[PDB]
C-alpha cells in the first residue's frame, strides 16, 4: 500500500530492491495518528509535517500524509479492499467470546509483540479505541515493552532453560517408531 501511495505522490517503485528501500523508509519515517481527520486537516496546512529522506542515489523524497496513512490500514482494512475488521475490533471480539469473569483480567493485561507494532503512538490509539468500545466503568492498560522485537526468542530461550521442559522434547527413536503425526498431538 505504501508503494501504491508513493506512486500517487509521484515516486515509482516496482522491483524488489525498491521494495527493500520502501521497507526501510517505512521503518524510519512512519507513525500512527491519534485522529485521522484532524491529521488530514493539519496536512492541508502542509508546512510542519513533511519530511525528507535520502535515497542511495542521492535523490531526496518528501513524504507527507503517507507517514500516517499506511499504518491506518491496520485499523481500516477497507483501504486495501479486505472485507474484515481492524486489530481493535478483532481483539474486542476475541475477548468478548471468552467467559465473563476472565474478561476483567484480559482487559487488565494486554501484551503485544512483533515488528509491526513499533510505530510510536500505536499503544495510545489502541487504548483509546478499546476504552471507547469497552464500557467506561473500568481501567484498560496497555503494556508496550521496548524490546518486543525479540520477545519470542527470549521466551523460547527461557522455556528451553526450564528444567521441566528437558523431557518434553521429541527424540529420533520415538519419532521413527510413531511417525510424523506425533507432533500433532504434542501440545496441539
Amino acid at each position: 500500500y505504501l508503494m501504491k501511495i508513493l506512486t500517487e505522490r509521484g515516486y515509482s517503485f516496482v522491483t524488489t530492491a525498491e521494495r527493500e528501500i520502501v521497507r526501510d523508509i517505512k521503518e524510519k519515517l512512519c507513525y500512527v495518528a491519534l485522529d485521522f481527520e484532524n491529521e488530514m486537516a493539519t496536512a492541508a496546512s502542509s508546512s510542519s509535517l513533511e519530511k525528507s529522506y535520502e535515497l542511495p542515489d542521492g535523490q531526496v523524497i518528501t513524504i507527507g500524509n503517507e507517514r500516517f496513512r499506511c499504518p491506518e490500514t491496520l485499523f481500516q482494512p477497507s483501504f486495501i479492499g479486505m472485507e474484515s475488521a481492524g486489530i481493535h475490533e478483532t481483539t474486542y471480539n476475541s475477548i468478548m467470546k471468552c467467559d465473563i469473569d476472565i474478561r476483567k483480567d484480559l482487559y487488565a493485561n494486554n501484551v503485544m509483540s512483533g515488528g509491526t507494532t513499533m510505530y510510536p503512538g500505536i499503544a495510545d490509539r489502541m487504548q483509546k479505541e478499546i476504552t471507547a468500545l469497552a464500557p467506561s466503568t473500568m481501567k484498560i492498560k496497555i503494556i508496550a515493552p521496548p524490546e518486543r522485537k525479540y520477545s519470542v526468542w527470549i521466551g523460547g530461550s527461557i522455556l528451553a532453560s526450564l528444567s521441566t521442559f528437558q523431557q518434553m522434547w521429541i527424540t529420533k527413536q520415538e519419532y521413527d517408531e510413531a511417525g510424523p503425526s506425533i507432533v500433532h498431538r504434542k501440545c496441539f
Partner: peptide
Amino acid sequence: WXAXCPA
C-alpha cells in the same frame, strides 16, 4: 518520473 524511470 523523479525517482525510478526517467519522466
